[PDB]
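Follow-up to my post from last week.
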Amino acid sequence: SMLILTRRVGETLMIGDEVTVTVLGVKGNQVRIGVNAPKEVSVHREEIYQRIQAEKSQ
Amino acid sequence: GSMLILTRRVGETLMIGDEVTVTVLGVKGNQVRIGVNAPKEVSVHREEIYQRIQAEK
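User reply:
Got it. Predicted complex:
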């Protein structure tokens, strides 16, 4: 299920025990986001993530 | 930990690990509507709310 909420610029969301996702700013329909996560946790834009999955399948 | 700064337009998504996704659902002024997909056992908290909970022990 998808958790849907609101975050204003400057506000943060905590995922799990070590990850944070912060809205750093908004420009039209563009959102500048800051993700802080432990070294072991990878963070990728979806377009990159998809290619990674496709290449891990070989 | 490390910091990653990126841009996501409404409708775009980012992945954290292999089980979590964050999607920008909309923008109204300075507020952003966000959709988060995570496994049942992964807590999702608004930082300012979690801090209050922590404070009240």
